[PDB]
Amino acid sequence: HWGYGKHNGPEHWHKDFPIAKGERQSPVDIDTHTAKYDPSLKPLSVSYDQATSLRILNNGHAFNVEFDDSQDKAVLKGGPLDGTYRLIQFHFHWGSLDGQGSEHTVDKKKYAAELHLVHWNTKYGDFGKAVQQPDGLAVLGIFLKVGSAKPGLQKVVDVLDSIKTKGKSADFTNFDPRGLLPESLDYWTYPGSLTTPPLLECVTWIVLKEPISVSSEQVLKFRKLNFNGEGEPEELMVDNWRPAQPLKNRQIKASFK
Ligand SMILES: COc1ccc(CNS(=O)(=O)c2ccc(S(N)(=O)=O)s2)cc1
Ligand SMILES: [Hg+2]
Ligand SMILES: [Zn+2]
């Protein structure tokens, strides 16, 4: 149905998902000069040492690495959050060129890609219940800039060949998500939504100030994925990002000065 093409892209989404024009839609532009430093903000607590990755799959929109979330194995706490949020999956959004790809922008600046680590609030029992709550999900957004290779990313880059087309999956166990984190945990935070349909407004966004760098060849391999299924006409998976949405009645808080 929906996609990122001229005929089914972001500009058409509202027809099937009216919330597209809601009050707390993501992503947004982070204007650094008007974001408010909040000293009551606690530091983030990322406990990914017991993370259990299971699979990687191309869902026709991006590739997602899924984790075992049956127990508190990889959780996010602290920051603007109240409660424990479990990591369920992470995916990327990237562009056809190095100067675009991220969904959130900083002072209108676009990065080559953006990593989203999706977590759901454990007080709600399961992910499905979490998506029915204003504080159900917490997504950690990390910008990727092209530069030196990211060692922790290569394992992911190496398996892309086997999940070239939509619907394909591959076992992807023992992957450590900690290799994808920048050195600093400083962040911006604001209430938002999922950036793809159903565009549910259940997300507390936490965007890290510090981006990680990846090589030209690493992001290049992202661009060789296919939106289409096997046997269908080939369509390269690129520019799977949604444009910035109006901030409206929201303010972006910064954990740093
Ligand atoms: C049945 O109810 C639902 C509710 C939500 C989904 C979306 N799936 S999802 O949570 O993995 C995400 C989609 C986009 C994400 S972004 N780019 O904002 O981080 S996270 C599926 C079924
Ligand atoms: Hg919600
Ligand atoms: Zn995303």
Q: What is the C-alpha to C-alpha distance for residues 175 and 68, in angstroms, rounded to an integer?
A: 12
Which residue lies with its CA nearest to atom 2 of ligand 1? 128
Cβ-proximal residues to 60 (8 Å cutoff; 6+ apart), any chain:
3, 166, 167, 227, 228, 229
Ligand 1 atom closest to 93 (CA): 17
Which of 1, 12, 14, 61 is the catalytic position?
61
**Residue-range domain boundaries for the chain:** 1-257
Deposited experimental method:
X-ray
Residue nearest to atom 18 of ligand 1 (CA): 194
Q: What is each CA distance from 110 to 104, 212, 236, in whole angstroms?
A: 7, 14, 21
Looking at ligand 1, which atom is closest to the CA of residue 88?
A: 11
104 is catalytic: no
Resolution of the experimental model, in Å, one decimal: 2.1
Mutate to test the pocket of ligand 1, among 64, 67, 76, 118 (most ligand atoms within 8 A of CB): 118
CATH of 1-257, one of 3.10.200.10, 3.90.76.10, 3.40.50.970, 3.40.50.150: 3.10.200.10
Establish whether residue 119 lines the binding site of ligand 1, counting it when its CB lies within 6 angstroms of any ligand atom.
Answer: no
